[PDB]
Design a protein around this motif. Structure first.
Motif, mmCIF file in Angstrom:
data_model
loop_
_atom_site.group_PDB
_atom_site.id
_atom_site.type_symbol
_atom_site.label_atom_id
_atom_site.label_comp_id
_atom_site.label_asym_id
_atom_site.label_seq_id
_atom_site.Cartn_x
_atom_site.Cartn_y
_atom_site.Cartn_z
ATOM 1 N N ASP A 91 51.178 36.476 38.355
ATOM 2 C CA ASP A 91 49.944 36.950 38.931
ATOM 3 C C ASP A 91 49.638 38.423 38.624
ATOM 4 O O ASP A 91 50.124 39.326 39.315
ATOM 5 C CB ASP A 91 49.993 36.689 40.402
ATOM 6 N N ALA A 141 48.542 40.939 41.430
ATOM 7 C CA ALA A 141 49.459 41.270 42.520
ATOM 8 C C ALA A 141 50.304 42.457 42.103
ATOM 9 O O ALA A 141 50.976 42.425 41.042
ATOM 10 C CB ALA A 141 50.397 40.004 42.850
ATOM 11 N N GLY A 167 45.319 40.985 50.756
ATOM 12 C CA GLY A 167 44.674 40.319 49.652
ATOM 13 C C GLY A 167 43.333 39.929 50.138
ATOM 14 O O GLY A 167 42.849 40.485 51.119
ATOM 15 N N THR A 194 51.475 31.034 48.665
ATOM 16 C CA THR A 194 52.003 30.673 47.358
ATOM 17 C C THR A 194 52.936 31.726 46.827
ATOM 18 O O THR A 194 52.751 32.892 47.115
ATOM 19 C CB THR A 194 50.786 30.414 46.437
ATOM 20 N N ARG A 240 47.318 48.658 37.062
ATOM 21 C CA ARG A 240 46.435 47.497 37.299
ATOM 22 C C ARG A 240 45.626 47.247 36.068
ATOM 23 O O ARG A 240 45.171 48.220 35.448
ATOM 24 C CB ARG A 240 45.482 47.733 38.418
ATOM 25 N N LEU A 255 39.525 43.654 37.981
ATOM 26 C CA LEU A 255 40.919 43.375 37.692
ATOM 27 C C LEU A 255 41.068 42.024 36.983
ATOM 28 O O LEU A 255 40.522 40.999 37.439
ATOM 29 C CB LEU A 255 41.602 43.340 39.058
ATOM 30 N N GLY A 293 46.222 35.300 38.781
ATOM 31 C CA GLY A 293 46.433 34.624 40.036
ATOM 32 C C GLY A 293 45.234 34.080 40.774
ATOM 33 O O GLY A 293 45.369 33.560 41.869
ATOM 34 N N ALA A 294 44.050 34.334 40.217
ATOM 35 C CA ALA A 294 42.783 33.944 40.773
ATOM 36 C C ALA A 294 42.204 32.822 39.962
ATOM 37 O O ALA A 294 41.973 32.933 38.738
ATOM 38 C CB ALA A 294 41.791 35.160 40.783
ATOM 39 N N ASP A 295 42.006 31.682 40.602
ATOM 40 C CA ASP A 295 41.373 30.569 39.879
ATOM 41 C C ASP A 295 39.946 30.965 39.542
ATOM 42 O O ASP A 295 39.431 30.545 38.531
ATOM 43 C CB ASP A 295 41.310 29.317 40.789
ATOM 44 N N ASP A 296 39.337 31.714 40.464
ATOM 45 C CA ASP A 296 37.934 32.160 40.437
ATOM 46 C C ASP A 296 37.703 33.689 40.272
ATOM 47 O O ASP A 296 38.613 34.522 40.391
ATOM 48 C CB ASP A 296 37.251 31.736 41.752
ATOM 49 N N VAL A 313 35.681 36.742 41.713
ATOM 50 C CA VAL A 313 35.109 37.168 42.944
ATOM 51 C C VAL A 313 34.754 38.668 42.890
ATOM 52 O O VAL A 313 35.596 39.509 42.634
ATOM 53 C CB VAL A 313 36.065 37.013 44.153
ATOM 54 N N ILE A 335 36.780 30.833 50.265
ATOM 55 C CA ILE A 335 37.959 30.984 49.413
ATOM 56 C C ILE A 335 39.040 31.720 50.173
ATOM 57 O O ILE A 335 38.779 32.547 51.071
ATOM 58 C CB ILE A 335 37.643 31.772 48.123
ATOM 59 N N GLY A 336 40.261 31.413 49.790
ATOM 60 C CA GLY A 336 41.423 32.024 50.392
ATOM 61 C C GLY A 336 42.360 32.767 49.462
ATOM 62 O O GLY A 336 42.368 32.637 48.241
ATOM 63 N N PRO A 361 38.020 42.683 48.767
ATOM 64 C CA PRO A 361 38.410 44.103 48.717
ATOM 65 C C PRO A 361 38.390 44.661 47.303
ATOM 66 O O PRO A 361 38.429 45.877 47.111
ATOM 67 C CB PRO A 361 39.885 44.096 49.171
ATOM 68 N N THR A 362 38.417 43.767 46.309
ATOM 69 C CA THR A 362 38.407 44.232 44.926
ATOM 70 C C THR A 362 37.765 43.197 44.000
ATOM 71 O O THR A 362 37.880 41.996 44.233
ATOM 72 C CB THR A 362 39.854 44.516 44.525
ATOM 73 N N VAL A 398 37.531 40.765 41.060
ATOM 74 C CA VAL A 398 38.603 40.112 40.255
ATOM 75 C C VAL A 398 38.003 39.105 39.297
ATOM 76 O O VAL A 398 37.064 38.389 39.640
ATOM 77 C CB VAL A 398 39.710 39.437 41.126
HETATM 78 C C1 LIG Z 1 40.343 33.222 43.688
HETATM 79 C C2 LIG Z 1 41.031 34.123 44.695
HETATM 80 C C3 LIG Z 1 40.476 35.510 44.490
HETATM 81 C C4 LIG Z 1 40.465 33.555 45.969
HETATM 82 O O1 LIG Z 1 42.514 34.038 44.601
HETATM 83 C C5 LIG Z 1 43.732 34.809 45.056
HETATM 84 O O2 LIG Z 1 43.856 35.261 46.199
HETATM 85 N N1 LIG Z 1 44.807 35.047 44.252
HETATM 86 C C6 LIG Z 1 45.969 35.827 44.745
HETATM 87 C C7 LIG Z 1 47.281 35.005 44.692
HETATM 88 C C8 LIG Z 1 47.181 33.659 45.393
HETATM 89 C C9 LIG Z 1 47.004 32.467 44.639
HETATM 90 C C10 LIG Z 1 46.887 31.202 45.240
HETATM 91 C C11 LIG Z 1 46.956 31.076 46.627
HETATM 92 C C12 LIG Z 1 47.156 32.251 47.389
HETATM 93 C C13 LIG Z 1 47.282 33.533 46.797
HETATM 94 C C14 LIG Z 1 46.024 37.180 43.993
HETATM 95 O O3 LIG Z 1 45.907 37.326 42.550
HETATM 96 C C15 LIG Z 1 44.813 37.946 44.411
HETATM 97 C C16 LIG Z 1 45.070 39.418 44.328
HETATM 98 C C17 LIG Z 1 43.690 40.082 44.259
HETATM 99 C C18 LIG Z 1 43.541 41.435 44.927
HETATM 100 C C19 LIG Z 1 44.067 42.614 44.352
HETATM 101 C C20 LIG Z 1 43.903 43.880 44.957
HETATM 102 C C21 LIG Z 1 43.175 43.978 46.136
HETATM 103 C C22 LIG Z 1 42.645 42.800 46.705
HETATM 104 C C23 LIG Z 1 42.797 41.542 46.110
HETATM 105 C C24 LIG Z 1 45.870 39.820 45.523
HETATM 106 O O4 LIG Z 1 45.722 39.408 46.678
HETATM 107 N N2 LIG Z 1 46.809 40.659 45.200
HETATM 108 C C25 LIG Z 1 47.644 41.262 46.206
HETATM 109 C C26 LIG Z 1 48.872 40.394 46.265
HETATM 110 C C27 LIG Z 1 49.739 40.874 47.400
HETATM 111 C C28 LIG Z 1 50.615 41.921 46.809
HETATM 112 N N3 LIG Z 1 51.031 42.915 47.597
HETATM 113 O O5 LIG Z 1 50.904 41.856 45.641
HETATM 114 C C29 LIG Z 1 47.848 42.812 45.996
HETATM 115 O O6 LIG Z 1 48.052 43.436 44.921
HETATM 116 N N4 LIG Z 1 47.775 43.504 47.153
HETATM 117 C C30 LIG Z 1 47.978 44.957 47.277
HETATM 118 C C31 LIG Z 1 46.605 45.681 47.271
HETATM 119 C C32 LIG Z 1 45.695 45.468 48.486
HETATM 120 C C33 LIG Z 1 45.464 46.502 49.412
HETATM 121 C C34 LIG Z 1 44.597 46.341 50.497
HETATM 122 C C35 LIG Z 1 43.905 45.161 50.688
HETATM 123 C C36 LIG Z 1 44.112 44.146 49.769
HETATM 124 C C37 LIG Z 1 44.985 44.287 48.679
HETATM 125 C C38 LIG Z 1 48.885 45.281 48.485
HETATM 126 N N5 LIG Z 1 49.976 45.998 48.175
HETATM 127 O O7 LIG Z 1 48.680 44.910 49.647
#
Ligand SMILES: CC(C)(C)OC(=O)N[C@@H](Cc1ccccc1)C(=O)C[C@@H](Cc1ccccc1)C(=O)N[C@@H](CCC(N)=O)C(=O)N[C@@H](Cc1ccccc1)C(N)=O
Ligand SMILES: [Cl-]
Ligand SMILES: [Cl-]
Lengths: 99, 99
Positions: A25, A28, A49, A82, B8, B23, B27-30, B32, B47-48, B81-82, B84
């Motif tokens: 991912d 992430a 996220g 996941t 990133r 970004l 990890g994102a199917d979609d 957003v 979406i989740g 929040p970002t 993608v």
């Molecule tokens: C299509 C859709 C956008 C809805 O899909 C996903 O959620 N995919 C998931 C992974 C996932 C896949 C399948 C099921 C569940 C989760 C991830 O790739 C999404 C990404 C997208 C994102 C990146 C930065 C900020 C916000 C969002 C995500 O959630 N990444 C996270 C993963 C958690 C982690 N600590 O690594 C990430 O980098 N988080 C960071 C950044 C953050 C800060 C504040 C608020 C939000 C995020 C963190 N350290 O908390």
């Protein structure tokens, strides 16, 4: 390998002596795994996220084999929907995006 | 290009005549994006991710220039929040993971 993205980029990992499946991912910053026990100490943390935040436990210096590439790093554990391998480990196996 | 993951994987996109940063997220199917208006009709959707769910507006057949590659596809708009770019579009620019 070269992993296309028509399907979720899931790989097999071995961690704490268990076999699991996880998503490579690039979105992430961190590596987050569902509930499991792990050798050692930990500090509590929160991460966010798309839909908000969760509390996870953070374990440093954990060994993980991702497609047979061993790496040692921080792994977070908690109620993620996941298993995700984040950039902290992707950098260590030399993973790049290419287009 | 080849994009390493020490930072990133942010890219510049052009969508609805506007310039944004997003970004590349395997990890994102979609795809957003934060709030913005878009030419056309839409249907609501949820979406989740980590943290839970958000409501988004789903727009089809939107054109998007991602690092200069034009693609047309569904773009979801709502309180993420970002920005993608997910697999739905990553496939269309031919993006792969490589290690
Ligand atoms: C299509 C859709 C956008 C809805 O899909 C996903 O959620 N995919 C998931 C992974 C996932 C896949 C399948 C099921 C569940 C989760 C991830 O790739 C999404 C990404 C997208 C994102 C990146 C930065 C900020 C916000 C969002 C995500 O959630 N990444 C996270 C993963 C958690 C982690 N600590 O690594 C990430 O980098 N988080 C960071 C950044 C953050 C800060 C504040 C608020 C939000 C995020 C963190 N350290 O908390
Ligand atoms: Cl690490
Ligand atoms: Cl699409």
């Amino acid at each position: 390998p070269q992993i296309t993205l028509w399907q979720r980029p899931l790989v097999t990992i071995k961690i704490g002596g268990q076999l699991k499946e996880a998503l490579l991912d690039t979105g992430a910053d961190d590596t987050v795994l569902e509930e499991m026990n792990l050798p050692g100490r930990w500090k509590p943390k929160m991460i966010g996220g798309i839909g908000g935040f969760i509390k996870v436990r953070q374990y440093d210096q954990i060994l993980i084999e991702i497609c047979g590439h061993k790496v040692i790093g921080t792994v977070l554990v908690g109620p993620t929907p996941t298993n995700v391998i984040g950039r902290n480990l992707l950098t260590q196996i030399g993973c790049t995006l290419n287009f």
